[PDB]
């Protein structure tokens, strides 16, 4: 069984190291990392590559040998390293949830106010909060209370003997982030549903309003110099070449509707004809007339359930047993706890498959940087 465990944990470490290391080098060779949206994924891979290369290997050695043979200093260094890193990925999931939440509730205000300097600073807070929350307590609670409670040869968080400090830090690391992430992604699911009907009624109102009134209102909004719309025009124009791709993939009747509308938009400037064309296609595709709304809402439901259940099914068994143990010490037999402590690292090997490999730009550069072609 030691050979079976060593093989299965070794493959998960090789898969995690290869999965995250390739993600870091995918957009270094590829000139498409001029995106602050991918900064959070780039930093997420930094924490998960640390877990894959350094945490799974030193934990599997801790269980297979049934012993920590690297000394107390390496135990505290590993414990601080993987608790801060797993926490950093958790608050990079919270940072990503907050970024996606404010890009759907305030798509214009948030994007205009978000700059590469600001996004990088936000990542700095996700790592600084993780650092302060975990590194001081793990590395020095044996000096806050002057005694090394951790058993020699064992390696666990040394302050978990405290009954209220454990509850507090489990709230700040898992419970509050889980409720905040669940609520934020719940409002994301609802906002996606509202965006279905909203865009549908807007698509109706393009028909009612004459095109000249829409054009004159576009000029009346693009003349008043506002940084909210100046960025919006550049973003809309930039994604025009890959927005007409979905026009071919649109409905048969809807394709003729777009073709007729762009015919009237002929002889118009590039910053106004392409800006107007994006609005019509956005409400045409995502309007969800009869069943497209259900398909898109369920698509979001499946993606969000997979993203969230990769958090509950990976972290809740660990955190539930920590809280339960604080009430009844003689509970949750050790075999259950051991499997649940390893189970947390399963998020680090699946996270690249949920946010990086889910993108179309990724999952294709991987083959270019792995097949050497």
């Amino acid at each position: 069984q030691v050979a079976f465990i060593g093989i299965t944990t070794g493959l998960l470490s090789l898969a995690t190291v290869t999965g995250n290391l390739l993600v870091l080098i995918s957009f270094k060779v590829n000139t498409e990392l001029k995106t602050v949206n991918n900064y959070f994924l780039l930093s997420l891979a930094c924490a998960d590559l640390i877990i894959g290369t350094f945490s799974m290997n030193l934990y599997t050695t801790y269980l297979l040998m049934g012993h920590w043979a690297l000394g107390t200093l390496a135990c505290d260094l590993w414990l601080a390293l993987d608790y801060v890193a797993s926490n950093a990925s958790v608050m990079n999931l919270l940072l990503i949830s907050f970024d996606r939440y404010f890009s759907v509730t305030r798509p214009l205000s948030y994007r205009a106010k978000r700059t590469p300097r600001r996004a990088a600073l936000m990542i700095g807070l996700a790592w600084l909060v993780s650092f302060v929350l975990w590194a001081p307590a793990i590395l020095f609670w044996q000096y806050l209370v002057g005694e090394r409670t951790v058993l020699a040869g064992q390696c666990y968080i040394q302050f978990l003997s405290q009954p209220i400090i454990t509850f507090g830090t489990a709230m700040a690391a898992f419970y509050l982030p889980v409720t905040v992430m669940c609520t934020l992604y719940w409002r994301i699911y609802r906002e996606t549903k509202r965006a279905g009907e909203r865009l549908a009624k807007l698509l109706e109102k393009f028909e009612a309003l004459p095109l000249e009134d829409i054009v004159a209102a576009l000029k009346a909004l693009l003349a008043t110099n506002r940084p909210e719309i100046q960025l919006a025009v550049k973003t809309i124009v930039e994604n025009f070449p890959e927005i007409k791709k979905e026009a071919e993939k649109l409905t048969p009747e809807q394709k003729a509707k777009l073709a007729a509308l762009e015919a009237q938009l002929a002889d118009l400037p590039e910053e106004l004809r392409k800006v107007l064309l994006s609005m019509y296609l956005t409400g045409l595709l995502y309007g969800g007339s009869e069943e497209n709304r259900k398909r898109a809402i369920e698509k979001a439901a499946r993606t969000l359930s997979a993203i969230l259940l990769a958090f509950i099914l990976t972290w809740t068994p660990y955190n539930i047993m920590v809280l339960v143990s604080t009430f009844c010490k003689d509970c949750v037999p050790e075999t259950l706890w051991e499997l649940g402590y390893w189970l947390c690292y399963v998020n680090s090997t699946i996270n690249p498959m949920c946010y990086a490999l889910c993108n179309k730009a990724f999952r294709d550069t991987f083959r270019l940087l792995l097949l050497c072609r």
Epitope: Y62, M65, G66, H67, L151, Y156
Partner: nanobody
């Protein structure tokens, strides 16, 4: 559970023992602390699952037939004198939350 260390000690190489009538010591944690005046809790050596060891000269061996340990020391120096208390049921327990019945009785090894 009572941890009766069967090794008296006072050997001027030696051989310690600890017969602790336990229920589940498989896949657990057996060890020894050389509790001397210098340090109240000092690492000595530990057997464990997989028959892997880790010292602080000596040798420590396992036996799962009767839940027993043999700290077969070799060429022990005079500084090795201490009160070795058995430490099974450490089980490298996370937050010692299952059963730390490890304390037991301590020997008197004099070198």
């Amino acid at each position: 559970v009572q941890l009766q260390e069967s090794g008296g000690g006072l050997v001027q190489s030696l051989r310690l023992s600890c017969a602790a009538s336990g229920s589940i010591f498989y896949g657990y944690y057996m060890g020894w602390y050389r509790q001397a005046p210098g340090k109240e809790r000092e690492f000595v050596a530990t057997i464990n699952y997989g028959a892997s060891t880790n010292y602080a000269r000596f040798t420590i061996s396992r036996d799962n037939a009767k839940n027993t340990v043999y700290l077969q020391m070799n060429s022990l120096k005079p500084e090795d004198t201490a009160v070795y208390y058995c430490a099974v049921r450490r089980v490298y327990v996370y937050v010692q939350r299952y059963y730390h019945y490890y304390w037991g009785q301590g020997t008197q090894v004099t070198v």
